[PDB]
Design a protein around this ligand. Structure first.
Ligand SMILES: CCCCCCCCO[C@@H]1O[C@H](CO)[C@@H](O)[C@H](O)[C@H]1O
Ligand SMILES: CCCCCCCCO[C@@H]1O[C@H](CO)[C@@H](O)[C@H](O)[C@H]1O
Ligand SMILES: [Fe+3]
Ligand SMILES: [Fe+3]
Ligand SMILES: [Fe+3]
Ligand SMILES: [Fe+3]
Ligand SMILES: [O-]
Ligand SMILES: [O-]
Lengths: 268, 264
């Protein structure tokens, strides 16, 4: 009835674009996170011992990138203002939206050419990628950036896309581990920011939550900036365990097993 | 129960032995929901090319068909079950590609220019999945020969390369080209449903694989012909969507809201 053969038999729906509204719900898929704030309050900073050369290489290269990025963004010294927080994450989530989508595509492409079951990996990686891009859609609202950032963002994609693509082919283990350790840093950053709100070292003006954040994370009009950070950090901690899991699975030759996290959205 | 205690765990490697293989988990939960006697009336459309690009897309699709019909010996012998399934195997390995690359490219845009996408990415992503679900379904009716596996692997290399540069140069062209591919998908499968009804093709695999049954939500008594019917409706959705998207590009509406987010 709603979507059926008369609509399926139409050449184009170009005529309808003017009369369809812009809703903030349609910006993501319907696979939204659903956290409970006083629970996720207790998300904590973890660190996973690296096994071999690959994990060490992933860890050192994450650590060398934090440092570079700390020092070129003048961030390490000055006061922790709301402007250097938004503006740092802003840049960081342009890059964070990439690894999920290269891995997903590539798993998709082998599923097709070897004609084999993927068993839940692709969509987990595809929603990681959207989730990070939803973080971007949200920070964008809190603070539009300048031309310098806009330029670095664009060149950075080219370097990162190209790197991650060859990395994923040569060694998905390395990329899942590399992400794993990125998310350790992302959780460190965000718990720091929530600590600073609490100790009064940062009082934010942007103490609304933009509509895109409000529907996506299902927050109430009364939600503080700190609440926004809290859900975001939870999201990041999820990705932390999921990719450390996926890297472990690779290390143990389980790249073709069932993705465990498909289950861990069930109430047993 | 997905809370701060599981979020605080290093790894779930230890659980992979005890998590069951479920046929529901092969896809997203964004599944099609057709009503069989409705979609029975899906029909065969053709969209006038607007300009040179649409024409060039149209000619590419038509030269591929000819090539692929002649080297697959489709004319030669009878319309068998073997030779239908075996051709759709090959075609869905290529059909899972365009939507993944288009979606990935729109994702990369949204990230680097920091702009709203307004619902395109996920439409194109599930198209890709949907076609890959067609493949997971047909793989069960018939594992292909070693020569077909080989030809599929070389094909993905050319097609993935081709679509990547084409989408970058001209997403209008790729959307139109897909648009016209799906016209053939609908021609083909209507033709198959016809043969079943006229008795020229008496199918053996009258047992819809479990992947297909739960993906499309069909009854246990559903027939191979029912399967073709939903599959052909899926293909028709994509026909109008990518012809829509191609038109949108032609009119410089690439950054408008994806009309099908409403028509959901
Ligand atoms: C391409 C430029 C290479 C410059 C060499 C410095 C590489 C990283 O530098 C090291 O990284 C750590 C990051 O956790 C810092 O905290 C250390 O203080 C620093 O020695
Ligand atoms: C790379 C090799 C290309 C060979 C070019 C010859 C094209 C074959 O002749 C053809 O006639 C068909 C009639 O059924 C038409 O449908 C096609 O448009 C056309 O390709
Ligand atoms: Fe992030
Ligand atoms: Fe992240
Ligand atoms: Fe198809
Ligand atoms: Fe198709
Ligand atoms: O992040
Ligand atoms: O097809």
């Amino acid at each position: 009835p709603v979507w059926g053969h008369t609509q399926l038999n139409r050449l184009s729906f170009l005529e309808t674009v003017p009369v369809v509204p812009l809703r903030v719900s349609d910006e993501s898929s319907e696979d939204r996170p659903t956290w409970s704030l006083p629970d996720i309050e207790n998300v904590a900073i973890t660190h996973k011992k690296p096994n071999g050369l690959v994990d060490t290489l992933a860890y050192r290269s994450v650590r060398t990138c934090r440092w570079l990025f700390d020092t070129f963004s003048l961030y390490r010294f000055g006061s922790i203002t709301e402007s250097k927080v938004i503006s740092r994450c802003l840049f960081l989530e342009t890059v964070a939206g990439v690894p999920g989508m290269v891995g997903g595509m590539l798993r998709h492409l082998s599923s097709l050419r070897y004609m084999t079951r993927d068993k839940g990996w692709i969509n987990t990686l595809l929603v990681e990628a959207e989730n990070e891009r939803m973080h971007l859609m949200t920070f964008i609202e809190l603070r539009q950036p300048g031309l310098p950032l806009r330029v670095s963002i664009i060149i950075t994609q080219a370097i990162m896309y190209l790197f991650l693509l060859v990395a994923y082919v040569i060694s998905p283990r390395f990329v899942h581990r590399f992400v794993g350790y990125l998310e350790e840093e992302a959780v460190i950053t965000y718990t720091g920011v929530m600590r600073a709100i609490d100790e009064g070292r940062l009082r934010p003006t942007k103490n609304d939550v933009p509509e895109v954040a409000r529907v996506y994370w299902n927050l109430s009009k009364n939600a503080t900036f700190r609440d926004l950070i809290n859900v975001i950090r939870a999201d990041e901690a999820e990705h932390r365990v999921v990719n450390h899991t996926f890297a472990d699975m690779h290390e143990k030759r389980l790249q073709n097993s069932v993705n465990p996290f498909v289950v861990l959205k069930k109430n047993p």
